[PDB]
Amino acid sequence: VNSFSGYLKLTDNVYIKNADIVEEAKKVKPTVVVNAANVYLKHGGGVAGALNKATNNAMQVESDDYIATNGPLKVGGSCVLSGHNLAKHCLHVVGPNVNKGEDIQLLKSAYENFNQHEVLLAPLLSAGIFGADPIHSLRVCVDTVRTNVYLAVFDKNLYDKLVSSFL
Ligand SMILES: c1cc(-c2ncc[nH]2)ccn1
């Protein structure tokens, strides 16, 4: 049993809910929240800006030190950093940004990072301001992630379309 409430079950391991991922994390304090990161961990807007704002910029301060030591992530890669006031840990995952011309085949690699964690609260990778088709992102999630993932879809309209169209 876990703390996640009000999710629709899509598969054995994937659950979905209409919610702002920032609002959720504060209530549940999950072991892992996933950030929709970029390779520079520059959390300016979208999921990353909203998560970072909720940490009072502490996520950005920690991220800048990480990049100064380790250099940029890979597209499709990830790192584990603090969850600050939102979660125990934040898994920063880089999905391909279609609005930068990145290979959408990298979306599966991105979701493979989730399999290193037994339970996660996450957004749909490469969705929102990353520009991918969220219906596609949900299909790759279901076909790639084997661990227990609780997805948050910010747009009520999009949430209803994701559920209604789910095979
Ligand atoms: C994009 C933005 C957000 C967000 N939460 C609060 C303000 N903006 C959440 C998910 N995707």
Domain boundaries, the chain: 1-167
136 contact partners, CB below 8 Å, separation of at least 6: 104, 107
**Phi first, then psi: what are they for 91, rounded to 5°?**
-90, 105
Give the Cα separation of 131 and 143 in Å (integer): 20
Q: Is 71 exposed, middle or buried (0-12, 13-18, 19+ CB in 10 A)?
A: exposed
In the numeric block, the tokens 């892992």 are attached to 32
Q: What is the resolution of this structure in A?
A: 1.0
Tell me how far the alpha carbon of residue 53 lies from the centroid of ligand 1, in angstroms.
10
Tell me how far the alpha carbon of residue 50 lies from the centroid of ligand 1, in angstroms.
5
Amino acid at 25: A
Q: How was this structure determined?
A: X-ray
- Element holding 160 (H helix, E strand): helix 156-164
- Is ligand 1 within 6 A of the CB of residue 50? yes
